[PDB]
Design a protein around this ligand. Structure first.
Ligand code: 6IA
Ligand code: 6IA
Lengths: 130, 132
């Protein structure tokens, strides 16, 4: 019922519009805790960690390399959160071996998708596992 | 005694020469588990690195170039309780991730801004006086 969404901010805002589409679709399946990703660092880290601790599921869009997104994934793994990572191969980038290599059973999943299918992919995951 | 160094790879290799200098200087204070950063499959890479991280006495990360892997390593290392030094170079023109700078917490997670010419003496100082 509570969803933590990860997406690049200071790693770059190229995929901002897509993050907005992702958040909007995630709302059907839960309370999105991290709305800001779509739209004082001490405060932000604490606020977000509190949100992460209370989240039922963690969704990250991992196309744009980001320290913060990586960090949220690492903390989430260590909190035993179920994780879905969405990556876009058409971008031409190669996903971090630490994110792709983190894939493990149902608990940590990395999904490759084409941009126009992001909502359908989210529907697929939540129907199947949530 | 053993040190785990994090540096961007697939996030980009812009700062590779700085990674080489850091690894070089870290070899004065312990064995570096992750020297390859300064130069199987993703599953193997992840497991190998995670095993090294779990046994590391200290984690050092250069955090100027944004990187999923580096972030991930810092997240896993925080949960494990490993002492962390992050090195950020502001002359890059970048603003460091709020989740990295905000993670700073006493002796267990430090975030140091550095000028590129002083990076070695910064590492000397950390191991001399800022490492519990
Ligand atoms: C008061 C604000 C909304 C300030 C703006 N700053 C932020 N606010 C909320 N979450 C953030 C902020 N910066 C980074 N994050 C989190 O860290 C991730 C982005 O990391 P990055 O900035 O290193 O690329 C996102 O998934 C966010 O959840
Ligand atoms: C064909 C390649 C580019 C292979 C690189 N494969 C790798 N080998 C060893 N460690 C890695 C590798 N990729 C990521 N890492 C680790 O994760 C961090 C870099 O992640 P990044 O690729 O998301 O920037 C570094 O601190 C490394 O310790």
């Amino acid at each position: 019922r509570s969803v933590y969404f990860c997406g690049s901010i200071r790693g770059g805002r190229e995929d901002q519009a897509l993050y907005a589409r992702i958040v909007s679709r995630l709302r059907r399946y839960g309370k999105v805790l991290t709305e800001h990703v779509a739209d004082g660092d001490q405060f932000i880290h604490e606020q977000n960690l509190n949100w992460l601790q209370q989240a039922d599921v963690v969704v990250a869009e991992v196309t744009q390399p980001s320290l913060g997104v990586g960090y949220e994934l690492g903390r989430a793994v260590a909190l035993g959160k179920p994780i879905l990572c969405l990556f876009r191969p058409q971008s031409g980038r190669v996903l971090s071996a630490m994110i792709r290599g983190a894939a493990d059973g149902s608990r940590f999943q990395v999904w490759d998708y084409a941009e126009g299918e992001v909502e359908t992919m989210l529907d697929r995951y939540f129907e199947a596992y949530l």
